[PDB]
């Protein structure tokens, strides 16, 4: 539905990428999600503020993701990719689901040399 800047990270094989994504929503925040769409839409990590963290199929997302709250009330949703290989490139995006309906996504393009 709605988009929220987001850049192109130009990285070198072996780098570390720290993609962060914030929303102010609390009352109407249903879930946060990290997805990698390349030729798949691949769900990496799904966090629900009451039901906890859930990893998408094939993924070890528990160690690479985090959701914390700023006391100015913003929720930080973050994905960390370590020692990125040539294959980790492609379109990462962060999708917030709001109540009762809408979606706010932020798209990150990781381009590896």
């Amino acid at each position, epitope marked *: 539905e709605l988009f929220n800047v987001g850049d192109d990270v130009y990285a070198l094989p072996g780098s570390d990428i720290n993609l962060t994504c914030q929303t102010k929503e609390k009352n109407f925040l249903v*879930q946060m999600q990290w997805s990698k769409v390349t030729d798949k839409n691949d769900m990496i990590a*799904l966090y629900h503020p009451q*039901y906890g*963290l859930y*990893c998408g*199929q094939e993924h070890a997302c*528990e160690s690479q993701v985090a959701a914390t709250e700023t006391e100015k009330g913003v929720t930080n949703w973050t994905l960390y990719l370590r020692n990125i290989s040539s294959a980790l490139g492609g379109k990462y995006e962060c999708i917030f689901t709001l*109540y*009762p309906e809408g979606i706010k996504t932020t798209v990150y393009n990781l381009i590896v040399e």
Partner: antibody
Amino acid sequence: VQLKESGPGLVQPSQTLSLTCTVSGLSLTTNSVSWIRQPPGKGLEWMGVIWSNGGTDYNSDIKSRLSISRDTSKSQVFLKMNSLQTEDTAMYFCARNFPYPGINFDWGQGVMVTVSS
Amino acid sequence: QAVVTQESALTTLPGGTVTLTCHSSTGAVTTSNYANWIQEKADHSFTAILGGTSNRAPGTPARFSGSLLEGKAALTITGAQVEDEATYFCSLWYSGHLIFGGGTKLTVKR
């Protein structure tokens, strides 16, 4: 990724039923496990859920008798139900990531538990 | 907390498309009801078909799709195959209690 339910096959209207759902190859910290039962002839009844984060929610008609807990070190969820009645004989299924998040949804095979003297 | 009703029975030819729906007594279904569908065949056999409104479960063929249409959640098979003749149960989530519908009886005329 395999779900196996195990528990007593026949338990008398005296006891407390205890089944345990054991999940291979996944940490219960990023998966939730729910218990659904279906007495023969009757419809499905959801009983409760243990979320990835350890919280729980129960069916309001069984909340008082039902306890769902987990052991993240053995990757197992337990159900204990006191005040066994004779209807409580049913097929007992566990389903992971059900109802939430409903992605990676998978429903075990079920274990028959018959409650009669 | 509400009553979930589905179509009692539906029929198609192979290659047809049918849409089963799943109605919430309590108003229009939001994604926050996490509608899901499991398929029953013989023998106390349940297969997870689709969950979280639109996510196919591991193994579910591509003909299975889910959506929110009208005031309800909807499972749509596109190109029904004879193997899809089954009873389909939907269930809805009402912030703490999960209520199942009665199950639709999909017949696919081989």
